Design a binder for this molecule. Structure first.
Ligand code: F43
Ligand code: TP7
Ligand code: TP7
Ligand code: CL
Ligand code: CL
Ligand code: K
Ligand code: MG
Ligand code: MG
Ligand code: MG
Ligand code: MG
Ligand code: MG
Ligand code: MG
Ligand code: MG
Ligand code: MG
Ligand code: MG
Ligand code: MG
Ligand code: MG
Ligand code: MG
Ligand code: NA
Ligand code: NA
Lengths: 248, 548, 442, 442
């Protein structure tokens, strides 16, 4: 597959995030328990709640589509559908909102992805969400200064950074430690305090942010200079326009 | 010269506009704000008086971890907190809507024919004047025929009246001038001649019913109230039997055959009668705004005054209250009429077009759309990238999408002289923006955006329509902020560039050229500022009939 | 047959056509000519090619007084009407030689369009007629002149108006006798939302044919509404027959006997006499110098009374040659006949009630208008279940020129197109012929 | 004949039924099974006799939480259902051997009613079904128990609700898949105002049958609306065939290849491969390490893409067994495929746009709801001309129980009655069989 046109680092990074054969760079280690804490849906050691019985316990009639489509593990179990949501700074966060939704529906099964300017969300069955969330948190999808895990009060994507290089957070869920140069998650994504904070590692330095970012800006790589990417957008506009008129 | 938004950015923040870093969390939350402080105190008083908790700053999340900004009302020197631009808190905004809602245009052409042909009586400027003195007594709610009528208090209904206009100068000049909208006085010479030629010898009433009635009732009241008192005044002034078969012809003419509503009724899911905001087509909104007849030498000013008119009405009152409610959509709209930001972008585009093509001299085709809309889109987005304070100001992607695309679409229409290619440019802007920043608006912002390119030039039943005829009930447009008022601007744009007197309905244009209105439609942004400052005097209040 | 009744059928000159036809041969549910008229009304559209051309030339689109400067397009539509109509027909039809009709009128200024019946058999309702016709002519015009992508939306606006910003086809240059489904007062009302003036126009002011077309449309709607189901069915069929189809020549003969010098009152007297003679009513008891009449067949009394009501309208408004007094006739025929007999008036008071409001709303400031702008879907005149509006059609047919909002003023496009259709223009002829044809199948 | 295209047709198990069927044999305008389905949906009513009985016994009539103390009537309706239904049938039918059906279900608690097709042939629209059914059951109940004049109005309220004070049948104890004509967003929309949950209910959550029923209704509406007239007709027919009828087994085979481990992206990759292999698209230009695809047949590209869109929904929402993400699939299948190819997405962006607003209005405070309450007439989901809603039907069929407003919650009465009808329950079977039968008549 091609994924995205263009000849910039930005374009290549957009393709890499979408390509399920591209190995996302792992930047930090997070325990299973700490992913669960960050998500905030259940307590460590709590059984998965259910929204319906396990599929095995149901007596569904013959349906060739069902038979051919393997349910994800949490669907088999009857898990609730839950979410993880990220905000990405326009100051060169590695992932960005449409980059995420596009990539998620290439890489992940059974996914409800939504894009907004200030927040991007995936909803899926809870145990599967936990596995996906580990990858979203440990890899280059995430920078702990320029990205935030936020289920509410998401303001910040468009704000100036603070003096530590951290994105604004009304609820201050991620705290930069000057003594370690590391960021700690001190609250879960909805803003409730954690008993023990979670180490999220060091912020990426400027050079590495520029290597990895998927936003075009005049002070990075400008979209208008990725002339092949612009060409394809303009083509889609023209072909849609003609098609709606007379199917030519 | 400095970009037009620089002064506003310097007012908002201590840092220079280009500075990338700031410090948060040190402003005391709501305590930084004069207006939030007023609200906290008011909530305490309200709760104490009524015995039910109300406004409380400790509910939910703590506002003001960042700077709570002032906004410059564009084209003014007025800076206010955004709460002062909420329609609930701004009497100018409320009155703007009331003045539209309470107006209808009603011909006298069928009525005078009824008089001459069915009644066999003559119509002259003198008899028209007598009729107008009669209907100006009756319209606010006073009697002319029956004994033992009880009537509205004249001072409560002082804003209700009837004027007329006609394209025949000699006829207009013979009617008592208290009652006449004088086209030659209100419009510059070339516009006046256009408008008079459209109207010809037709004679039209502009009827305004009382604000207090419109607020008590609804928009669908207006044409009915109008017709009742026209009917009574025809009976009295032309000495008719007070209820004979011909009386029904006056009713049918005033209620149906020669009435122009400001808005058409809506389908059931969003059920509303006439003269509600969703029924007002974009071309009418542009014609209601009177910037065109004052600022004609500056098509950007005219177009952006229409944007302000429409962003407020359509996003704040209509989408933000009629169709939703609560805190609502103040800043989705203010983005389009504050800090001179849309103005900066649109002057850039107008100058680009002037220099390359000449206004209205570009080919009306997709090549021009691609050229102009792309260039202007990249300029606007560059400004958010160059000025971190600007990006923090227009913090919501939807706001930025609407502003950038409005500039792109208006500019494209300045080039082609055609609103439809302007519209195509609006959608291209969205697509480019989305790819540049990997974001656009709120979750549902680009429903119409993605349908957009294909439906610009469609001819199918519920798809195809010139932009001027579209409105808030065009299917794709029926739900979402950050488009409708901007489309009214794009509708205005090619007509302002062409020097046209009107966009879609000359009668609507003339009908708001009237300083007896409560709101001043020649200076919509100035009026919004006056309302923000609590300096606007609305109609419709009940002070006279309530305790001191 | 469900019912035992038979009626004699006559033509619009009062001459016998067929004796002793079962009543249900006139039912909308059984009569193939009523089916053909109703399907015809669903499928027929008037296209104003001159109007489309002028709207384009002037950019006057989207409703009254509207205009978009700079959008003008000068296309020789009427001069190329034959090609445009043929191209439109190829899109409108389902198959070659099906029942699609596209006929030019007025030197190419107008077109009669009948959309193929098969499209309606797989449709929920009737809007396919204007919508298929509109898009076929929009496309045919664009293709005739190679109108560009940039300009074609003006052709669309010139044909169908401000739709979909407006709910209606506001400013359209096509017309139908039906109006949009959203404007129905209630479900099942569509055949009632047909202006009286349109009926009078289609039937060329032939009084009996106007009455017949109106009655057919009203009473067919009563079946769609469910009013003519079960207990009420025979009442509605007898009303169709006697009030609108001149069954037994009763309307005709009452008019003949009262036309020279008669009044509403003299028609009442003759109708009561005829009802007594035919055994429909009988003296139930005697008060002081006053006979109280009763009936063992209320539906038949109602039908006789309804025939008299039509004849009274024809006599009263025919003598004035002025339609306005039909509201008075509808009221006082019914008021008078109750105090003359002790029996209930037509539609058990609902014609009288309709007439009270109709009188008010055709002589007052509050709404309504002249008789011709009413219809069975109008809030003023919806209340009687078919027994009022046909009299209004008769009265407007008889008007010699007293109305400002005449059929000439409101219904010219509909006249030119719909009066071409024989079954629309002379429905009494075709419905009677069909009834005679199926008489031994009922 | 008009179009040269032929398609291979399969059953819901992926087995070939008939090869090389002319495309127009699947047209709503030609296919007799689509006609039968559409007329069936116009004419079918679910009657809740138990509900009527309980409303009467409690005097809970006229809408939610309403009650009139003192008006209670205790009638043994369900215990006398056979007699009541037979009496109602006698009023509903036109003749004794016509296609009227009245069938008791659930021990007399429910009745399936199919009003005779002939009533609709002489009707403007479809409201005769609830209105004729309602009055026949009101009258049959009154007659069964000799309900007095003084009380009978409560039976009417228990059957049809607050109508006519309300515009809708508010509180009624009858149901139809269609809704009242006044609620149409535009003329021609009635077959679009059918809740997704109703489609899923009628088809017993069989994914392909739900997709087929929804596509048949949506694309038939596109003909009634005039969207499938002229230039657009082939596009709509190909969409019906490939997206809703599993033409050439393309949906089925994409699901088979992607069901075990696949994603929306893997379905896209397979669809682009298949379009290229079949000659639907071709490389037009080479950019830097990027192929720009073109097509000489935009309608066929659109149809292939639409089949992939359906398969992507089945794979994505099938894997979650949770419908909510269909709004996401409808968006990003289309967004991704444009940047994968340089070609326009399904319905030239209109599915993507529909999906943007549908996503918003199924995850926000402002309106909408869960996937099952949408429909082609909903303001959120009307914008694509048939290519979005059938995917929503498929997704809800695949939902294992994650929805509050499920078909079990919204559509139980519909389910019990409408799933009895073979052509409603298994439309893919009957439409394919009919296409095969007429294949040499096209
Ligand atoms: C709960 C929702 C979901 C929904 O359906 N509506 C919400 C909330 C709603 C509330 C918020 C009021 C409150 O705080 O109590 C109101 C004011 C509507 C109302 N009920 O009066 C609103 N949004 Ni919202 N909403 C807005 C916006 C936005 C932007 C904000 C992004 C940012 O970085 O700050 C994002 C969408 C996006 O990412 O593009 C957004 C989301 C959301 N919007 C998220 C909450 C986001 C969060 O948790 O922080 N709105 C805007 O982008 C600007 C205009 C602004 C609206 C108020 C006004 O116009 O003044 C407000 C419009
Ligand atoms: C009849 C109808 O008017 P039209 O015939 O549609 O103009 C209707 N008015 C009314 O019913 C007026 C009722 C109030 C005044 C008379 C009170 S007795 C209305 O405006 O919708
Ligand atoms: C979708 C529809 O809501 P329902 O799905 O019918 O509840 C509709 N609301 C809206 O369109 C809300 C528009 C204003 C708020 C969102 C602005 S982006 C309405 O209330 O009629
Ligand atoms: Cl009887
Ligand atoms: Cl094609
Ligand atoms: K009000
Ligand atoms: Mg680990
Ligand atoms: Mg300058
Ligand atoms: Mg400063
Ligand atoms: Mg307290
Ligand atoms: Mg003055
Ligand atoms: Mg009208
Ligand atoms: Mg002033
Ligand atoms: Mg004789
Ligand atoms: Mg006599
Ligand atoms: Mg049968
Ligand atoms: Mg009894
Ligand atoms: Mg190569
Ligand atoms: Na709280
Ligand atoms: Na708070």
């Amino acid at each position: 597959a091609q994924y995205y046109p263009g000849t910039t680092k930005v374009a290549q990074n957009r393709r890499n995030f979408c390509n399920p054969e591209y190995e996302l760079e792992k930047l930090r280690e997070i325990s299973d328990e700490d992913v669960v804490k960050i998500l905030g849906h259940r307590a460590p050691g709590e059984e998965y709640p259910s929204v319906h019985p396990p599929l095995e316990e149901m007596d569904e009639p013959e349906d060739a589509i069902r038979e051919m489509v393997e349910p994800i593990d949490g669907a088999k179990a009857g898990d609730r559908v839950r979410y993880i949501q990220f905000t990405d700074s326009m100051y060169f966060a590695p992932a960005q909102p449409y980059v995420r939704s596009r990539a998620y529906l290439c890489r992940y099964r059974g996914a409800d992805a939504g894009t907004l300017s200030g927040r991007q969300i995936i909803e899926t069955r809870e145990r599967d969400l936990e596995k996906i969330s580990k990858e979203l948190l440990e890899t280059e999808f995430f920078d702990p200064a320029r990205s935030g895990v936020r289920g509410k009060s998401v303001h910040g994507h468009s704000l100036r950074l603070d003096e530590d290089g951290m994105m604004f957070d009304m609820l201050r869920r991620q705290i930069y430690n000057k003594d370690t140069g590391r960021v700690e998650m001190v609250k879960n994504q909805i803003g409730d305090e954690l008993d023990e904070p979670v180490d999220l590692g060091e912020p990426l330095d400027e050079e590495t942010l520029m290597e990895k970012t998927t936003i075009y800006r005049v002070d990075g790589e400008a979209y208008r200079d990725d002339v092949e990417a612009v060409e394809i957008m303009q083509r889609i506009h023209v072909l849609r326009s003609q098609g709606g008129f007379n199917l030519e | 010269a400095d970009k037009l938004f620089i002064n506003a950015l310097k007012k908002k923040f201590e840092e220079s506009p280009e500075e990338k870093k700031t410090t948060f969390y040190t402003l005391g939350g709501w305590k930084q704000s004069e207006r939030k402080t007023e609200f906290v105190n008011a909530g305490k008083e309200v709760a104490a008086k009524r015995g039910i908790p109300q406004y409380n700053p400790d509910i939910g999340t703590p506002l003001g971890q960042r700077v709570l900004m002032p906004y410059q009302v564009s084209t003014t020197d007025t800076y206010v907190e955004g709460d002062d631009l909420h329609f609930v808190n701004n009497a100018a905004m409320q009155q703007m809507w009331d003045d539209i809602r309470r107006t209808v245009i009603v011909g006298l052409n069928h009525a005078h024919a009824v008089i001459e042909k069915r009644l066999g009586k003559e119509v002259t400027p003198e008899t028209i004047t007598h009729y107008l003195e009669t209907v100006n007594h009756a319209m606010p709610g006073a009697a002319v025929v029956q004994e033992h009528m009880v009537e509205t208090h004249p001072a409560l209904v002082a804003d209700s009246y009837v004027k007329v206009f006609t394209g025949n100068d000699e006829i207009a000049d013979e009617i008592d001038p208290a009652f006449v909208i004088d086209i030659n006085k209100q419009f510059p010479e070339d516009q006046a001649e256009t408008l008079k030629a459209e109207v010809g010898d037709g004679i039209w009433q502009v009827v305004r019913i009382p604000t207090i009635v419109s607020r008590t009732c609804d928009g669908a009241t207006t044409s009915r109230w109008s017709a009742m008192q026209i009917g009574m005044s025809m009976i009295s002034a032309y000495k008719q039997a007070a209820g004979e078969a011909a009386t029904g012809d006056f009713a049918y003419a005033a209620k149906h055959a020669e009435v122009i509503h400001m808005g058409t009724y809506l389908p059931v899911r969003r059920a509303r009668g006439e003269n509600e905001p969703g029924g007002v087509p974009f071309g009418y909104l542009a014609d209601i705004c009177q910037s065109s007849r004052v600022n004609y030498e500056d098509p950007v000013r005219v177009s952006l005054d229409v944007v302000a008119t429409g962003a407020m009405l359509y996003d704040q009152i209509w989408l933000g209250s009629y169709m939703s409610g609560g805190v609502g959509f103040t800043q989705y709209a203010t983005a389009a009429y504050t800090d001179n930001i849309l103005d900066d972008f649109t002057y850039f585009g107008k100058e680009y077009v002037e220099d390359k093509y000449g206004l209205c001299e570009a080919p009306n085709n997709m090549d021009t759309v691609l050229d102009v809309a792309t260039e202007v889109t990249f300029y606007g987005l560059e400004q958010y990238e160059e000025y971190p304070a600007l990006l923090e100001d227009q913090f919501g992607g939807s706001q930025r999408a609407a502003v950038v695309a409005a500039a792109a679409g208006c500019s494209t229409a300045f080039a082609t002289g055609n609103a439809q290619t302007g519209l195509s440019g609006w959608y291209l802007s969205m697509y480019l923006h989305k790819e540049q920043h990997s974001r656009l608006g709120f979750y549902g912002y680009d429903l119409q955006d993605q349908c957009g390119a294909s439906n610009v030039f469609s001819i199918r039943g519920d798809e195809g329509l010139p932009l001027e005829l579209r409105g808030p009930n065009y299917p794709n447009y029926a739900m979402n902020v950050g488009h409708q008022g901007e489309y009214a601007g794009i509708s205005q744009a090619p007509h302002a560039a062409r020097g046209d007197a009107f966009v879609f309905n000359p009668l609507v244009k003339i009908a708001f050229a009237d300083d007896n209105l409560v709101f001043d439609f020649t200076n919509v942004r100035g009026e919004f500022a006056k309302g923000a400052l609590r300096e606007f005097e609305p109609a419709g209040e009940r002070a006279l009939i309530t305790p001191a | 047959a469900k019912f035992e009744d038979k009626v004699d059928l006559y033509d619009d000159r009062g001459n016998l056509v067929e004796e002793q036809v079962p009543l249900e041969a006139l039912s909308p549910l059984r009569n193939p000519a009523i089916k053909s008229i109703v399907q015809g009304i669903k499928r027929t559209v008037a296209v104003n090619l001159e109007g489309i051309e002028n709207a384009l030339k002037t950019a006057k689109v989207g409703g009254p007084a509207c205009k978009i400067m700079g959008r003008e397009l000068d296309l020789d539509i009427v001069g190329n009407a034959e090609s445009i109509a043929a191209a439109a027909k190829e899109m409108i039809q389902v198959t070659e030689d099906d029942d699609t009709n596209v006929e030019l009128l007025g030197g190419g200024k107008r077109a009669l369009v009948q959309v193929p019946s098969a499209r309606f058999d797989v449709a929920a309702e009737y809007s396919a007629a204007p919508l298929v016709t509109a898009t076929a002519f929009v496309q045919a015009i664009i293709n005739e002149f190679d109108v560009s992508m940039y300009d074609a939306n003006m052709v669309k606006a010139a044909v169908l108006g401000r739709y979909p910003q407006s709910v209606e086809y506001m400013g359209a240059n096509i017309a139908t006798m039906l109006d949009i489904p959203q404007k129905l007062e209630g479900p099942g009302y569509a055949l009632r939302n047909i202006m009286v003036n349109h009926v009078v126009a289609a039937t060329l002011k032939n009084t009996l044919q106007a009455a017949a077309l109106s009655t057919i449309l009203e009473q067919t709607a009563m079946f769609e509404m469910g009013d003519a189901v079960g207990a009420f069915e025979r009442m509605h069929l007898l009303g169709l027959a006697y009030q609108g189809m001149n069954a037994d020549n009763l309307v005709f003969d009452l008019v003949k006997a009262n036309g020279k010098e008669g009044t509403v009152g003299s028609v009442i007297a003759d109708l009561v006499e005829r009802a007594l003679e035919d055994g429909v009513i009988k003296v139930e008891k005697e008060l002081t110098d006053y006979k109280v009449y009763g009936t063992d067949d209320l539906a038949m009394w109602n039908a006789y009374a309804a025939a008299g009501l039509m004849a009274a309208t024809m006599v009263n408004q025919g003598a004035a040659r002025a339609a306005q007094g039909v509201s008075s006739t509808l009221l006082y025929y019914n008021d008078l006949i109750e105090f003359e007999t002790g029996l209930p008036s037509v539609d058990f008071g609902k014609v009288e009630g309709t007439a009270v409001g109709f009188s008010f709303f055709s002589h007052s400031i509050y709404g309504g208008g002249g008789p011709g702008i009413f219809n069975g879907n109008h809030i003023v005149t919806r209340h009687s279940k078919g027994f009022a509006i046909p009299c209004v059609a008769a009265a407007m047919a008889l008007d010699a020129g007293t109305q400002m909002f005449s059929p000439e003023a409101t219904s010219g496009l509909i006249k030119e197109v719909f009066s071409q259709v024989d079954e629309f223009r002379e429905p009494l002829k075709y419905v009677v012929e069909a009834a005679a044809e199926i008489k031994n199948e009922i």
